[PDB]
Design a protein around this ligand. Structure first.
Ligand SMILES: *[C@@H]1O[C@H](CO)[C@@H](O[C@@H]2O[C@H](CO)[C@@H](O)[C@H](O)[C@H]2NC(C)=O)[C@H](O)[C@H]1NC(C)=O
Ligand code: NAG
Ligand code: NAG
Ligand code: NAG
Ligand code: NAG
Ligand code: NAG
Lengths: 49, 272, 92, 25, 97
């Protein structure tokens, strides 16, 4: 038996962290670009799988 | 007035070990047949609980005061409806406020006043030949009531109170708690006719009614009903007669449990 | 009351936004609302009509597009990721 | 396949379909 | 960023010559209509009736002592009616009661 595929996952990190709150969403923008970096890492995981 | 009925001899407590009983739904929420864990105030499976037995013809008459300890587990198998309620408080007198719970043949009576409890309180009942019925007019449990701050009432929970000479076929088990100024009642009716004192432990209790009252309870006391004796040509009595009775007392403790829910919404089993 | 629509719900004091619908689940008299694994609410009883209803959160999903190439052409097509076609035009 | 068995979308979390389906594989 | 999905992608990356493939430019979330729905049931209102519509009252030396609990109090029935000579509330807003 050899594993070859795992169910790829992507996360709406804005929703996960800020919780669809306007001021919370505004504040997180001050922490740079972790938002997009994590999303692109996950999509790379998916396409690679 | 009050009736003084005491036994000079004090008997040692008798011990019997619980097996699995004494579990209640931790919340009023539902989960769909999924194992789930929680950490609340429960009854350990193997707890050396206390055993009390009232004997009548030789006879045993003693109803001592027991502490509450953050919650109480109560159960009994009565056949003549002798047990009728519970009384709670801190000083159990007119100095402070105490909680009263009692049942009658018609309804359920719960009262919150500055009740003055007796040394050996009980509820007096008697029979009227003209009325052909039993009534409980005399409130021999307490002498007077004052500072009535709360009163509650709800329909009878499991049974109808009458004068019966029955057999042991069912067991009533109750769990009592008070948290954050709220008082909660848990119950479950299970018909068991086995000689054993406790069942395997399949069943689990359900919430009955939540009473928000901001009072401190440190100890509790049972309530028993005493029947006035109508003497036949060949009977003797001391002015009051009651049937044999027994019950059990359990104590909560801070623990955490693992619970099994089913698709229907019934807790089939659990583990400590 | 609002049913079969994307709304917010409060009920006995909890919070949440989603779509309410009829439920096949049968609850005991003490039960108030249904909770799913990982501590997420999925069912709630109606306190007025004493009826249980399901909870489905808002149909969230990322938006994606397809493109054969900028220099190839300017045409484009769009793919909505894991959303039913019934309620797509709410995009504005 | 009948032997192997243990989710859905909850609160922002997403799952994407596989590139090749079981019939194609 | 609001003209054509292609433009939104050109903003998501940093180029004007985006290449063929698949791109996750942004995300969609449906919006609800605000509604505080289905407050729980009402058992019984406050027994104001036998207090304000009592046929007799008591003397000032023997002022009666009334308790109100486990019920819903609707003061709007009180302060909306123009049948009371005076209406004074101290340290509390009757409208917000
Ligand atoms: C509280 O609950 C009662 C019992 O369900 C509600 O009364 C019923 O409401 C349904 C809903 O449409 C009606 O079809 C019935 O005709 C009602 N019956 C009676 C006897 O009123 C009641 O509406 C709920 N809310 C309040 C504020 O009482
Ligand atoms: C409980 O009671 C039984 C019966 O006498 C006794 O053997 C035991 O030591 C007691 N304590 C515990 C913890 O079981
Ligand atoms: C569970 O619910 C079903 C409903 O179809 C019923 O038939 C069954 O008897 C129930 N079982 C228990 C243990 O409640
Ligand atoms: C246009 O794009 C295609 C992509 O296949 C490429 O082969 C071609 O060289 C491009 N032409 C120019 C002029 O960039
Ligand atoms: C989409 O909605 C239609 C009508 O409501 C329904 O028939 C269909 O099964 C739905 N499809 C999915 C994937 O939910
Ligand atoms: C008192 O009774 C009168 C008529 O008898 C009625 O108009 C009035 O509304 C009642 N008061 C209240 C507070 O409802």
């Amino acid at each position: 038996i050899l594993p070859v595929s795992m169910t790829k996952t992507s996360v709406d990190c804005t929703m996960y962290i800020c919780g669809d709150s306007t001021e919370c969403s505004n504040l997180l923008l001050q922490y740079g670009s972790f938002c997009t970096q994590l999303n692109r890492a996950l999509t790379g995981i998916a396409v690679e799988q | 007035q009050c009736v003084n009925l005491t036994t000079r001899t004090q008997l040692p407590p008798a011990y019997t070990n619980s097996f699995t009983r004494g579990v209640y739904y931790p919340d009023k929420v539902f989960r769909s047949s999924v194992l789930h864990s929680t950490q609340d105030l429960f009854l350990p499976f193997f707890s050396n609980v206390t055993w009390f037995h009232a004997i009548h013809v030789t006879k045993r008459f003693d109803n001592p005061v027991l502490p509450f300890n953050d919650g109480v587990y109560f159960a009994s198998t009565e056949k003549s409806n002798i047990i009728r309620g519970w009384i709670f408080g801190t000083t159990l007198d007119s100095k402070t406020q105490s909680l009263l719970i009692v049942n009658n043949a018609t309804n359920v009576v719960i009262k919150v006043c500055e009740f003055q409890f007796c040394n050996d309180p009980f509820l007096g009942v008697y029979y009227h030949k003209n009325n052909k019925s039993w009534m409980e007019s005399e409130f021999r449990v307490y002498s007077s009531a004052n500072n009535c701050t709360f009163e509650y009432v709800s329909q009878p929970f499991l049974m109808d109170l009458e004068g019966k000479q029955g057999n042991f076929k069912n067991l009533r088990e109750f769990v009592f708690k008070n948290i954050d100024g709220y008082f909660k009642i848990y119950s479950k009716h299970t018909p068991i006719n086995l000689v054993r004192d406790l069942p395997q432990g399949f069943s689990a209790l359900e919430p009955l009614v939540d009473l928000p009252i901001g009072i401190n309870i440190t100890r509790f006391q049972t309530l028993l009903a005493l029947h006035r004796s109508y003497l036949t040509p060949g009977d003797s009595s001391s002015g009051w007669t009651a049937g044999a009775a027994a019950y059990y007392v359990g104590y909560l403790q801070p623990r955490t449990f693992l619970l099994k829910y089913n698709e229907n919404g019934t807790i089939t089993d659990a583990v400590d | 009351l609002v049913k079969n629509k994307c709304v917010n719900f409060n009920f006995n004091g909890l919070t949440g936004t989603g779509v309410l619908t009829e439920s096949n689940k049968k609850f005991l008299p003490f039960q108030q609302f249904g909770r799913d694994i990982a501590d997420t609410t999925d069912a709630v009883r109606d306190p007025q009509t004493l009826e249980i209803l399901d909870i489905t959160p808002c149909s969230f999903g990322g938006v994606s597009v397809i493109t054969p190439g900028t220099n190839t052409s300017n045409q484009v097509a769009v793919l909505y990721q894991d959303v039913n076609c019934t309620e797509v035009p709410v995009a504005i | 396949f009948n032997k192997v068995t243990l989710a859905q979308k909850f609160n922002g979390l997403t799952v994407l379909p596989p590139l090749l389906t079981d019939e194609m594989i | 960023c609001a003209l054509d999905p292609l433009s939104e992608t050109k903003c998501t990356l940093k180029s004007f010559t985006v290449e063929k493939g698949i791109y996750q430019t942004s995300n969609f979330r449906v919006q609800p209509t605000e509604s505080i729905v289905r407050f729980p049931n009402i058992t019984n209102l406050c027994p104001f009736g036998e207090v304000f519509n009592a046929t007799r009252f008591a003397s000032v030396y023997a002022w009666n002592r009334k308790r109100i609990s486990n019920c819903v109090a609707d003061y709007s029935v009180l302060y909306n009616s123009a049948s009371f000579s005076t209406f004074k509330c101290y340290g509390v807003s009757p409208t917000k009661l």
